[PDB]
Amino acid sequence: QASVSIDAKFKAHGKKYLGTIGDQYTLTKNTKNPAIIKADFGQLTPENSMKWDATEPNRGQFTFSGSDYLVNFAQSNGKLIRGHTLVWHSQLPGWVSSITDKNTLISVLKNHITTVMTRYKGKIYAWDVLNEIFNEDGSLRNSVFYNVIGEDYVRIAFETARSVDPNAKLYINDYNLDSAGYSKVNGMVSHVKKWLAAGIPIDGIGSQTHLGAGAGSAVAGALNALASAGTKEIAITELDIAGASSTDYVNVVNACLNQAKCVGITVWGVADPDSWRSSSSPLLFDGNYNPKAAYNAIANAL
């Protein structure tokens, strides 16, 4: 744990949280990881326990041991929770992707959203209702949901989520929304404008922000462009930067800090060894679970 909590410092500026991710293994692999999370971050996103493959491995049969643990840990430690993720084409059981009947798929989709959301009803700050539904060019990704149900799945997902748990912020999450002008950013903005105008309950847009070195500076304008979609809020949801330079990190923190709609930042991991992009040492704590320069830089920028 670092003495100065960047979550405390971020919140000091009116932001909701500066969090990270977790699950059983990392929360218990050593003493430092859970200690870091408790002392320096104020929110948690399950790294894998709430995905479709881990919650409903078989049709109508749910497995919540993993998710229960992550939720219980966060609730027990005053950490906000972002559920992740209800509808995605990746980490999706073959039983789902094989459905060819529209109504059957809609029934399955609704039951999955309803069961998963109902279980943690009132404990989730935000839910990534839909994840990565766009092609890089801004067009809708032809996933089973899109192919079988069509664009109406977007409405179905959000409306269902909205009624099941009216207390959670409903988000659409995606990566590569890292620079204003980018095709995917334009596709996200235009589609959401249309969906909001249609009455689809989309409270926020989540920008993953999985960056390469030097891409930090463009994030500010990206956030500015996303803000034009007209959602209640937006957030940096899965932050990591190859090289983990202080400049890149401070640029990203400032990008959110200086944008009114950005409610928070979630770094995709605590320490490098546990990073899904570990070879690039993209996180704020090193292999010894000690703060890196970027962590301190961030604290000093706030």
Ligand X SMILES: O[C@@H]1[C@@H](O)[C@H](O[C@@H]2CO[C@@H](O[C@@H]3CO[C@@H](O)[C@H](O)[C@H]3O)[C@H](O)[C@H]2O)OC[C@H]1O
Strands (DSSP E) found in 249-300:
262-267
- Chain position carrying tokens 């401070």: 250
Three-class DSSP category at 224: helix
By CB under 6 A, residue 56 contacts ligand X: no
Whether 151 sits among the annotated catalytic residues: the reply is: no
Looking at 47, 56, 233, 238, which residue is catalytic?
A: 238
Does position 208 interact with ligand XYS (CB under 6 A)? The reply is yes
Q: What is the radius of gyration, based on Cα positions, of the chain?
A: 18
Q: Is residue 210 near ligand XYS by the rule CB under 6 A?
A: yes
Of the candidate residues 131, 143, 207, 231, the single one contacting ligand X (CB under 6 A): 131
Q: Which does 276 bind (CB under 5 to 8 A by kind): ligand X, ligand XYS, none?
A: ligand X
Three-class SS of residue 61? strand
Contact between 297 and 5 under an 8 Å Cβ cutoff? The reply is no
- The interface mask with ligand X, positions 156-195, x = CB under 6 A, is -------------------x--------------------
Q: Which of 47, 132, 159, 233 is catalytic?
A: 132
Q: Phi and psi of 291, rounded to 5°? A: -60, 140
Rounded to the nearest 10 degrees, the angle between the axes of helix 102-119 and helix 152-164 is 30
Residue whose structure tokens are 């039951």: 111
Q: For ligand XYS, how many residues bind (rule: CB under 6 A)?
A: 3
90 token code pair: 């990746």
**Residue in the structure block whose two tokens are 């200690």:** 35
Q: Does 281 bind ligand X (CB under 6 A)?
A: no
Q: Is residue 50 within 8 Å of 40, Cβ to Cβ?
A: no
Which residue lies nearer to ligand X by CB, 56 or 238? 238
Q: By CB under 6 A, tell whether 25 contacts ligand X.
A: no
Q: Is 132 a catalytic residue?
A: yes
Among 25, 199, 276, 293, the residue binding ligand X under the rule CB under 6 A is: 276
Give min distance, CB of 36 to ligand X, in A: 17
- For residue 210, which phi and psi values (nearest 5 degrees)? -95, 100
Nearer to ligand XYS, 5 or 131 (CB): 131
- Residues 18, 239: Cα–Cα separation, whole Å: 11
132-191: contacts with ligand XYS (CB under 6 A): 175
Question: Under the criterion CB under 6 A, does residue 280 sit at the interface with ligand X?
Answer: no
The H-or-E segment that residue 129 falls in is strand 126-131
Query: Quick check: helix, strand or coil at residue 124?
Result: coil
48 binds, among ligand X, ligand XYS, none (CB under 5 to 8 A by kind): ligand X
User: Is residue 209 at the binding interface for ligand X, with CB under 6 A as the rule?
Assistant: no
- Closer by beta carbon to ligand X, 10 or else 52: 52
Selected from 40, 47, 165, 233, the binder of ligand X by CB under 6 A is: 47
Per-residue contact string for residues 226-265; x = within reach of ligand X by CB under 6 A: ------------x---------------------------
* Residue from 235, 236, 241 nearest 284 by CA: 241
Q: How far is the CB of 151 from ligand XYS (least distance, A)?
A: 22
Q: How far apart are CA 148 and CA 101, in angstroms?
A: 7
Determine the Cα–Cα distance for residues 210 and 21; give it in Å rounded to an integer: 14
Catalytic residues: 132, 238
List residues near ligand XYS by CB under 6 A.
175, 208, 210
List residues near ligand X by CB under 6 A.
47-48, 131, 175, 238, 276
